[PDB]
């Protein structure tokens, strides 16, 4: 029944002491932190405490959309030698660093995911031609479904995959997704392999990457400009923002202290010295 927005405990007034009670003396070997409050070691006055921990609840700490990727697409002249660019992104929070570091204060999590899409476009050639307003198709292709090979092939029909048709210059697109994990929680860390190497089998055959579970964990987003080719080329970018709503987290971890280096916990040589010089007896 204690809520996140409740005021923290009052300071109770306390006077001088001379006894066998020894709050200040402890033994951290036990693995415990000494639960002291100021009245345990100094004289205190009575204070009616009004402050609360409302903004540091797990929900409030994560209640922000973070950019997780930028997808590039275009729509060129029909006459181009290069193919019309459509984008394919493997869904993840590990291509950027800020949300990743926040989630990684914990080992496991459960949440509903809100994705918001910001879309911007521009001209590229020092032309004077125009382009009519673009519609974008953001298709979710879950593991197993046919990934698009061409901006206009049959997969963009989406009979079963969810798609967003976004109109340029309108409010940024937004959808929600439930907790979709195949485990009871999302694992931010998996100390294991997806394959057991057997003796009776070749090493190549039993091999797999360290810390990787399902190769295609969550599938991909495939994005295209739905408009046909235009004489003047336009390039667009789709920025994806992820917000974990309705979140639960388990098993706290020390935060990432040296630069991320890949999707795993690996680090790069030359980045391992975060701390700066400061003298022991200098304030």
């Amino acid at each position: 029944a204690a809520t996140s927005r409740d005021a923290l405990p009052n300071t109770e007034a306390s006077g001088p002491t001379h006894s066998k009670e020894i709050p200040a003396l402890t033994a951290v070997e036990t693995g415990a932190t000494n639960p002291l409050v100021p009245s345990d070691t100094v004289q205190t006055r009575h204070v009616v405490q009004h402050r609360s921990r409302s903004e540091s609840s797990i929900e409030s700490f994560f209640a922000r959309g973070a950019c997780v990727t930028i997808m590039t697409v275009d729509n060129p002249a029909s006459t181009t030698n290069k193919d019309k660019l459509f984008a394919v992104w493997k869904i993840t929070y590990k291509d950027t660093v800020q949300l990743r570091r926040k989630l990684e204060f914990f080992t496991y999590s459960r949440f509903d995911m809100e994705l918001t899409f910001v879309v911007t476009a521009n001209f590229t050639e020092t032309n004077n031609g125009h382009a009519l307003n673009q519609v974008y198709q953001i298709m979710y292709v879950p593991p197993g479904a046919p990934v698009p090979e061409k901006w206009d092939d049959y997969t963009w029909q989406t009979s079963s995959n969810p798609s967003i048709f976004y109109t340029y210059g309108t409010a940024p697109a937004r959808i929600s997704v439930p907790y979709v994990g195949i485990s009871n929680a999302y694992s931010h860390f998996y100390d294991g392999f997806s394959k057991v190497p057997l003796k009776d089998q070749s090493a190549a055959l039993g091999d797999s990457l360290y810390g990787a579970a399902s190769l295609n964990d969550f599938g991909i987003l495939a994005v295209r400009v739905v408009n046909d080719h235009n004489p003047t080329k336009v390039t667009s970018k789709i920025r994806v923002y992820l917000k974990p709503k309705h979140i639960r987290v388990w098993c706290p971890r020390p935060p990432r202290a040296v630069a991320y280096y890949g999707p795993g916990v690996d680090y790069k040589d030359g980045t391992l010295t975060p701390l700066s010089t400061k003298d022991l007896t200098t304030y």
């Binding site: 809520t3 020894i22 415990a32 997704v177």
Partner: protein, 60 residues
């Protein structure tokens, strides 16, 4: 189906309330209530088998 909750009013100009109606069948579509609970840190700060009494010796 309207839910009526109170705001914790910070700066002032009774209880001020606000209203919420869920528009969708899927709870995943709902906004966050922010009506959250707190817990005691003990599973991390005092994970010892024998209960700690802070005025007593931690080792006896």
């Amino acid at each position: 189906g309207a839910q009526v909750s109170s705001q914790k009013v910070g700066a002032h100009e009774s209880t001020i309330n606000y209203t919420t109606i869920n528009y969708y069948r899927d709870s995943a579509s709902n906004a966050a209530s922010k009506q959250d609970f707190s817990q005691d840190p003990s599973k991390f700060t005092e994970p010892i088998k024998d209960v700690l009494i802070k005025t007593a010796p931690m080792l006896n």
